[PDB]
Design a protein around this motif. Sequence first.
Motif, PDB file in Angstrom:
ATOM      1  N   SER B  28       0.888  -1.296   0.264  1.00  0.00           N
ATOM      2  CA  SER B  28      -0.141  -0.048  -0.099  1.00  0.00           C
ATOM      3  C   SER B  28       0.813   1.129  -0.060  1.00  0.00           C
ATOM      4  O   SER B  28       0.494   2.066  -1.010  1.00  0.00           O
ATOM      5  CB  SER B  28      -0.863  -0.035   1.334  1.00  0.00           C
ATOM      6  OG  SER B  28      -0.296   0.503   2.207  1.00  0.00           O
ATOM      7  N   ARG B  29       1.699   1.410   1.102  1.00  0.00           N
ATOM      8  CA  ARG B  29       2.522   2.600   1.019  1.00  0.00           C
ATOM      9  C   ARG B  29       3.929   2.226   0.449  1.00  0.00           C
ATOM     10  O   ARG B  29       4.593   3.069  -0.549  1.00  0.00           O
ATOM     11  CB  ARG B  29       2.614   3.158   2.556  1.00  0.00           C
ATOM     12  CG  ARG B  29       1.216   3.752   2.885  1.00  0.00           C
ATOM     13  CD  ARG B  29       1.570   5.137   3.663  1.00  0.00           C
ATOM     14  NE  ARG B  29       0.528   5.851   3.865  1.00  0.00           N
ATOM     15  CZ  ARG B  29       0.450   6.866   4.143  1.00  0.00           C
ATOM     16  NH1 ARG B  29       1.526   7.800   4.213  1.00  0.00           N
ATOM     17  NH2 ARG B  29      -0.752   7.360   4.758  1.00  0.00           N
ATOM     18  N   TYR B  30       4.836   1.318   1.066  1.00  0.00           N
ATOM     19  CA  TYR B  30       6.090   0.788   0.658  1.00  0.00           C
ATOM     20  C   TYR B  30       6.016  -0.052  -0.586  1.00  0.00           C
ATOM     21  O   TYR B  30       6.419  -1.263  -0.112  1.00  0.00           O
ATOM     22  CB  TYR B  30       6.811   0.418   1.659  1.00  0.00           C
ATOM     23  CG  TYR B  30       7.482   1.637   2.719  1.00  0.00           C
ATOM     24  CD1 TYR B  30       8.010   2.702   2.123  1.00  0.00           C
ATOM     25  CD2 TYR B  30       7.453   1.600   4.006  1.00  0.00           C
ATOM     26  CE1 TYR B  30       8.570   3.779   2.978  1.00  0.00           C
ATOM     27  CE2 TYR B  30       8.026   2.529   4.950  1.00  0.00           C
ATOM     28  CZ  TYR B  30       8.428   3.816   4.170  1.00  0.00           C
ATOM     29  OH  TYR B  30       8.955   4.811   4.997  1.00  0.00           O
ATOM     30  N   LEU B  31       5.640   0.339  -1.691  1.00  0.00           N
ATOM     31  CA  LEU B  31       5.459  -0.477  -2.719  1.00  0.00           C
ATOM     32  C   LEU B  31       6.569  -0.585  -3.865  1.00  0.00           C
ATOM     33  O   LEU B  31       6.987  -1.588  -4.401  1.00  0.00           O
ATOM     34  CB  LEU B  31       4.138  -0.428  -3.454  1.00  0.00           C
ATOM     35  CG  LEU B  31       3.405  -1.809  -4.325  1.00  0.00           C
ATOM     36  CD1 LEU B  31       2.225  -1.298  -4.328  1.00  0.00           C
ATOM     37  CD2 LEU B  31       4.236  -1.855  -5.652  1.00  0.00           C
TER      38      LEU B  31
END
Lengths: 456, 42
Positions: B28-31
Amino acid sequence: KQYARHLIYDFRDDNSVISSRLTSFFTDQSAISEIILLLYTLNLKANTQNSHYKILSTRCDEMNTLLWSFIELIKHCLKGKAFEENVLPFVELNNRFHLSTPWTFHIWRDYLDNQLNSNENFSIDELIEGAEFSDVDLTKISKDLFTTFWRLSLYDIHFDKSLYDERKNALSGENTGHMSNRKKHLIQNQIKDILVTGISHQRAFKKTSEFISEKSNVWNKDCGEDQIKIFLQNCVVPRVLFSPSDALFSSFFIFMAFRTENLMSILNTCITSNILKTLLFCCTSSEAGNLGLFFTDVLKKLEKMRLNGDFNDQASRKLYEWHSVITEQVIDLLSEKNYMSIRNGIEFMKHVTSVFPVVKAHIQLVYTTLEENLINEEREDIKLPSSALIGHLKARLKDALELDEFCTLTEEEAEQKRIREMELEEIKNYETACQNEQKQVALRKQLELNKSQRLQ
Amino acid sequence: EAAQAKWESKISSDEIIRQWQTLRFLRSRYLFDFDKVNEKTG
């Protein structure tokens, strides 16, 4: 739409009296918005239990088909005000509880397009109505596109004229006889309904096609590569993994909103930063097949821009630069561990191999790497599509293939091509006639001694 | 944020199925990095 359900045995409108009696049982318990929040967290609670390995990969996918197919029963029956009083509002489905933005908009998209086509004074109501987005970061994303990408469906982005009229000649084709006056009353009443729905599709398609172009002047003014990077992970790739009908939407929209000089910047970024090996690891059987359906409509939509239209000559090589990365990204995944990174890899290649053959060198690479893990280790019966896939990769290996017609500059490879040309001049002197005995290495063995470098 | 905080405790101090149960939540954020941050891809 109704004829397509008739082919895949999706009988909704047949039994409307049975399905509306069942939905009333869930309302007297006052528990429609209690089932949805229960089936969601039970899909996330399955990332906490530890009993088995493969079944917990299936139970995560099985609680995803059950939640998707429960929403489709709510939308079919609760039409109107009854949808509003049962399903919770959009503001506190993201604040009190915490649902995810692919899942929050999937319930509330038919309602936010029926109210926008009802009145234009209601257009100022819903778009002000917005809650806090704690899942994705709104700090350097444009909400002029982040709300615009999540609001549109495939109904107002794509249009066709062909399939509307392919039913018209077929319906009157088979129905040519004297069977009743009532069915001929209804077959004519079926022909009139395709015509009214076709022209009302064009009314809604045209109002959206002008809508993006009045905003596309803003979006292609601040091209930060990190601003494309926030656009890629927060809205594009969560919509592709969701559903096959929402995978086609992220392929069509990116070619209608953006311009082709900026379009070569964004699709380069998804290719260059090697994430495709790490994407196909953390997916199920279904979520890997949808990422194949996104790439098979980029490469098909690009070779209509290369054959008819014109790419630049370095941009034509930039097409083949993406071709050499994607095969190196999947062969490193075709040789990985016990079950997950090999089950996704074959499932990815079942869709994309429609337009596979662009490069003659790359197909013989992926074909031989299928033959190595049938010798290394086999735990389950994974061979049953692997026995099928090896033929359809071989039958399209010999259709039409060349690397040198489309790549011009080869500094060592053309000097390699002078080497690989002269050794074939000697082997036809070796086999038919005989002057000098000279046995050389065949094609299959020099590949594997090169592939053991390419794996490492 | 606690999922990265366990990584910030692990460095300063099955396996694959628990590793697959932490990359499905960090998409979601650290992709975009996905290189070698929590552990090694192999």
